[PDB]
DNA sequence: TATGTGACACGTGCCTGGAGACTAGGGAGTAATCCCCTTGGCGGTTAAAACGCGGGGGACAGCGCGTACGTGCGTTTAAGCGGTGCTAGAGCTGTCTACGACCAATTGAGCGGCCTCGGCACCGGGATTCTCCAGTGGCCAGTGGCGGCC
DNA sequence: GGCCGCCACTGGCCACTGGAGAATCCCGGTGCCGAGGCCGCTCAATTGGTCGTAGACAGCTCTAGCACCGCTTAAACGCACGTACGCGCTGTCCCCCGCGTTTTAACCGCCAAGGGGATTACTCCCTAGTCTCCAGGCACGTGTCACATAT
C-alpha cells in the first residue's frame, strides 16, 4: 500500500517533470510534499534528492 | 557601462538553481582525501569504497544544508538577512549538540 | 600519503554553493571556518563509528553498508546504498 | 511607604527558587481533568492509574521547560528579553516538531 | 459526564512558574494560550500511543509502563517508572 | 536547633532461578585464492578556486516612546487533604486446542546474464523574461519678484 | 521709501516608464548507454503431516481507581500602576557580492599492481539444552534516625 502511494506520487511528479522514468529528485519532491510521509521521514535522507524549492518572503526584493 | 547585477539578484538566482539542482556541491577528490586523512587518525591503512565516500559526501551535504536552513530561520528570526556564527552555534545547541 | 590541511579542501565557494542550496541569501565571512569545524566534528563522529564497524568486521576496507549503519545510528538515516 | 521591587528582581528571585526547587509546578487535579478529557476524545470511559498521570505530568513539563530554555536562547539571540510566540514556533520548527 | 474545557486548568501563573523554571523572566501575554495548544499537541501525541498500548494489552485502564513506552518512542525517555 | 515520623534500611521464610555435569552438534575460526575491486600514477582540461575591487545593502548603535507586562494586594475559588464506599478491572490461575514451528521434496518464481533501444543526455538556435537603468513627469519646497502698506 | 506678505517661478527629489541586455527556457536534433525484458539456473517456498505448546478462554479476587463530601487555605484572579522593552527611525560604516582575471587542480581517461573480501573447505569449541539441586534475592515485617517542617 505505501509503495503504491509513493509510486503514485513519484509517477505524478515525473509526469509533471515530463519524464517517463522516476528519479530521486521526483522522490524528494514527492516525499517532502506529503505531510504524513514528510513527518514520517523527516530524519531520513535520500541519495541525490536535493531540496524543496523554498524561499523565505523577506529574501524576495521589495 | 558594463553590465552589473545588483547584489542578491545573482544570489537569489543561484538559490533557485541549487534548489532546482540535485548534484553534489563539493569536489570529489579533496573530499575523499580529507576522509582518508581523518580516518587515518583512528586506525592506519584504511581502504575506501568510492560508494562509501559518496555516501559520506551526500549525508554531509544534506546535514550541512539542513543546518543552513536552521541558520536561515535563526537569521530571519533575528530580523537579519546575513547569517552569523552565533546562528549556527544556536542551531547546533537547539538541535542538542 | 600523509595529508594535513584538507579541511580547507572544502573550499569557500563550495560552502557558498551549500548555502545557496540551503536558501542562504547572505553569508558572513566568519561562517566558512566555523562550518568547516562543524562538518569536521560531524564527520569524525560518523567515521569513528564507521571505523569501529569496519574493525568489528575484521576489515580494512570501508563499506558503504558500514556507513549507512553509522548514519542511522546517529539518527541521520540515508537511503540508496544497499541498506 | 509600601515597598515595591523593580521589575525583573522578583522574577529572578523565583527563577532562582524554581531552579533550586524540584517540585511540580502544575495543579494536579486540573491536569488530570485535561488528561481524561483528551483521552476520552480517542477512547471513552478511560481509567487512569494515578502514577501514569503523574508520569505524563513530569514528561509534560520536561518538554515545556526544555522548550522554554530553547526559546529563551532564541529571544536573547534576537537581542530581546520578552519572549514571543514566534520564538516558540522557531524552536518547534528547528526541533522538527 | 463529558468534559469540554480543562485546557484553562493550566493557569497563567502555572505557566509563569514553568517559565521561571525555564529561566524566562519576562513573558508576553500572547504566550500562554499558544503554549497551551503546543503542550496539548504533545498530549495527544503521547496519549494516542498510550491508548494504543492500553487497548493492545486488552486493558481498559491506562497503566504507567505503557506511558513509559509511549514516552521513549518520542525520544523522551523517562526514568523512575519503567517496571 | 526541635521533633516525630515514616521511609529506609535491615532480619527472615522461601522458592525459583542460577548453577554443576554431560552431550551433541553446529556456528565460528581458520587456510587458500582469486579476482575483483581497490590503489597508485600521468596528462590535458578547463571549471572552479582564488584574488581583487568598487559599492551598494545590511548589521548595528542610538533614541524616543508608548506600551504591555512585572509587581503588589485583596478575593474567590477551587485545589488540596482526608476519609468512606464501592466497584471495575487488572491480574492471577486451570484448560485444551489453534496454530505454528519442524522435516522431506520439489518446483517455479526469483535472481544472474545479455542485449538492445529508446528514454534521455547534450547542444545550439530562437523566444522569452526579467531587471536594471536612462529618461520622465509630478510634487514639494525653495526662492525671488511684486504690490500694498506704513 | 523701505518692508513685508503674497504670489508665482523653479529646482531638486521621488515615483513612473520604456527599453536593453543578459539570463533562462524551449524546440529541435543527435547519439548512447542503462532499462528492462528475455533467457537459464536454483533454492527456497510450498505441501503435507506431526508434536507440542501458547495463548485464549473461564473464572475469581481483591485492589486501585472513581466518586463524593466536607474543610481549609493558598492559589488564582483581577485590578492598579509604574517602568522598561520592543522596536521602529535614522543613519553610518563596512562586508560580502558581482564582476571580472588568473591559476590550479579536479576530473576524466587511461593504464598497471596487487591485496584482501569473499568464498569454499575443514575442523572443533562452545554453548544451548537437560537433569538436579540449593541458596540469593525478594516479599514481608518492623525498628529508627534524616530531615521536613517549625521556630
Curated annotation (Swiss-Prot), chain A:
Transmembrane segments: none annotated. The modification N6-(2-hydroxyisobutyryl)lysine is found at residues 18-19, 39, 62. Core component of nucleosome. Nucleosomes wrap and compact DNA into chromatin, limiting DNA accessibility to the cellular machineries which require DNA as a template. Histones thereby play a central role in transcription regulation, DNA repair, DNA replication and chromosomal stability. DNA accessibility is regulated via a complex set of post-translational modifications of histones, also called histone code, and nucleosome remodeling. The modification N6-glutaryllysine is found at residues 39, 62. The modification N6-(beta-hydroxybutyryl)lysine is found at residues 39, 62. The modification N6-crotonyllysine is found at residue 62. This is Histone H2A type 1-B/E. The nucleosome is a histone octamer containing two molecules each of H2A, H2B, H3 and H4 assembled in one H3-H4 heterotetramer and two H2A-H2B heterodimers. The octamer wraps approximately 147 bp of DNA. The modification N5-methylglutamine is found at residue 48. The modification N6-succinyllysine is found at residue 39. It comes from the Eukaryota. The gene is H2AC4. Disulfide bonds: none annotated. The chain holds residues 58 to 119 of 130 of the full protein. It is found in: Nucleus; Chromosome. Belongs to the histone H2A family. It is involved in the initiation of both imprinted and random X inactivation. Ubiquitinated H2A is enriched in inactive X chromosome chromatin. Ubiquitination of H2A functions downstream of methylation of 'Lys-27' of histone H3 (H3K27me). H2AK119Ub by RNF2/RING2 can also be induced by ultraviolet and may be involved in DNA repair. Glutamine methylation at Gln-48 (H2AQ104me) by FBL is specifically dedicated to polymerase I. It is present at 35S ribosomal DNA locus and impairs binding of the FACT complex.
Swiss-Prot record, chains B, D:
The modification N6-glutaryllysine is found at residues 20, 43, 79, 86. One of its GO terms (molecular function) is structural constituent of chromatin. The modification N6-(beta-hydroxybutyryl)lysine is found at residues 20, 43, 86. The modification N6-lactoyllysine is found at residues 20, 43. The modification Phosphotyrosine is found at residue 5. The modification Phosphothreonine is found at residues 44, 71. A lipid is attached at residue 74 (S-palmitoyl cysteine). Keywords: Acetylation, ADP-ribosylation, Chromosome, Citrullination, DNA-binding, Hydroxylation, Lipoprotein, Methylation, Nucleosome core, Nucleus, Palmitate, Phosphoprotein, Ubl conjugation. The modification N6-acetyllysine is found at residues 20, 43, 79, 86. The keyword Ubl conjugation applies. GO terms for biological process: chromatin organization; gene expression; negative regulation of transcription by RNA polymerase II; nucleosome assembly. The modification N6,N6,N6-trimethyllysine is found at residues 20, 43. The nucleosome is a histone octamer containing two molecules each of H2A, H2B, H3 and H4 assembled in one H3-H4 heterotetramer and two H2A-H2B heterodimers. The octamer wraps approximately 147 bp of DNA. During nucleosome assembly the chaperone ASF1A interacts with the histone H3-H4 heterodimer (via C-terminus of H3); this interaction is direct. Interacts with DNAJC9, CHAF1A and CHAF1B. Interacts with NASP; NASP is a histone chaperone that stabilizes and maintains a soluble pool of Histone H3-H4 dimers. This is Histone H3.2. It comes from Homo sapiens (Human). The chain holds residues 38 to 134 of 136 of the full protein.
Curated annotation (Swiss-Prot), chains C, E:
Keywords: Acetylation, Chromosomal rearrangement, Chromosome, Citrullination, Disease variant, DNA-binding, Hydroxylation, Intellectual disability, Isopeptide bond, Methylation, Nucleosome core, Nucleus, Phosphoprotein, Ubl conjugation. The modification N6,N6,N6-trimethyllysine is found at residue 1. It comes from the Eukaryota. The modification N6-methyllysine is found at residue 1. The modification N6-propionyllysine is found at residues 12, 25, 58, 60, 72. Changing residue 56 to R: In TEBIVANED4; results in severe early developmental defects when expressed in zebrafish embryos. There is a cross-link at residue 72 (Glycyl lysine isopeptide (Lys-Gly) (interchain with G-Cter in ubiquitin)). The modification Phosphothreonine is found at residue 61. Changing residue 16 to W: In TEBIVANED3; results in early developmental defects when expressed in zebrafish embryos. GO terms for biological process: chromatin organization; negative regulation of megakaryocyte differentiation; nucleosome assembly; protein localization to CENP-A containing chromatin; telomere organization. The modification N6-glutaryllysine is found at residues 12, 40, 58, 60, 72. There is a cross-link at residue 12 (Glycyl lysine isopeptide (Lys-Gly) (interchain with G-Cter in UFM1)). It is found in: Nucleus; Chromosome. The modification N6-butyryllysine is found at residues 12, 25, 58, 60, 72. The modification Phosphotyrosine is found at residues 32, 69. There is a cross-link at residues 1, 12, 40, 60, 72 (Glycyl lysine isopeptide (Lys-Gly) (interchain with G-Cter in SUMO2)). It is linked to Tessadori-Bicknell-Van Haaften neurodevelopmental syndrome 1: An autosomal dominant disorder with onset in infancy, characterized by poor overall growth, microcephaly, hypotonia, profound global developmental delay, impaired intellectual development, poor or absent speech, and characteristic dysmorphic facial features, including hypertelorism and abnormal nose. Other variable neurologic and systemic features may also occur. Tessadori-Bicknell-Van Haaften neurodevelopmental syndrome 2: An autosomal dominant disorder characterized by poor overall growth, microcephaly, hypotonia, profound global developmental delay, impaired intellectual development, absent speech, and characteristic dysmorphic facial features, including hypertelorism, abnormal nose, and wide mouth. This is Histone H4. It comes from Homo sapiens. The gene is H4C1. The chain holds residues 21 to 103 of 103 of the full protein.
Amino acid at each position: 500500500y505505501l509503495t503504491a502511494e509513493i509510486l503514485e506520487l513519484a509517477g505524478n511528479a515525473a509526469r509533471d517533470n515530463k519524464k517517463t522514468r522516476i528519479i530521486p529528485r521526483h522522490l524528494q519532491l514527492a516525499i517532502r510534499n506529503d505531510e504524513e510521509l514528510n513527518k514520517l521521514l523527516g530524519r531520513v535522507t535520500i541519495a541525490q534528492g536535493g531540496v524543496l524549492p523554498n524561499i523565505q518572503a523577506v529574501l524576495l526584493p521589495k | 557601462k558594463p553590465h552589473r547585477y545588483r547584489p542578491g539578484t545573482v544570489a537569489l538566482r543561484e538559490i533557485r538553481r541549487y534548489q532546482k539542482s540535485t548534484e553534489l556541491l563539493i569536489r570529489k577528490l579533496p573530499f575523499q582525501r580529507l576522509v582518508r586523512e581523518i580516518a587515518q587518525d583512528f586506525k592506519t591503512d584504511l581502504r575506501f569504497q568510492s560508494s562509501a565516500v559518496m555516501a559520506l559526501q551526500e549525508a554531509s551535504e544534506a546535514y550541512l544544508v539542513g543546518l543552513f536552513e536552521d541558520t536561515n530561520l535563526a537569521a530571519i528570526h533575528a530580523k537579519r538577512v546575513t547569517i552569523m556564527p552565533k546562528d549556527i552555534q544556536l542551531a547546533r545547541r537547539i538541535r542538542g549538540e | 600519503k600523509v595529508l594535513r590541511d584538507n579541511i580547507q579542501g572544502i573550499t569557500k565557494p563550495a560552502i557558498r554553493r551549500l548555502a545557496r542550496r540551503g536558501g542562504v541569501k547572505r553569508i558572513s565571512g566568519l561562517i566558512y571556518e566555523e562550518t568547516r569545524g562543524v562538518l569536521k566534528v560531524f564527520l569524525e563522529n560518523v567515521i569513528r563509528d564507521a571505523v569501529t564497524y569496519t574493525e568489528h568486521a575484521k576489515r580494512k576496507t570501508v563499506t558503504a553498508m558500514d556507513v549507512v549503519y553509522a548514519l542511522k545510528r546517529q539518527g541521520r538515516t540515508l537511503y540508496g546504498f544497499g541498506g
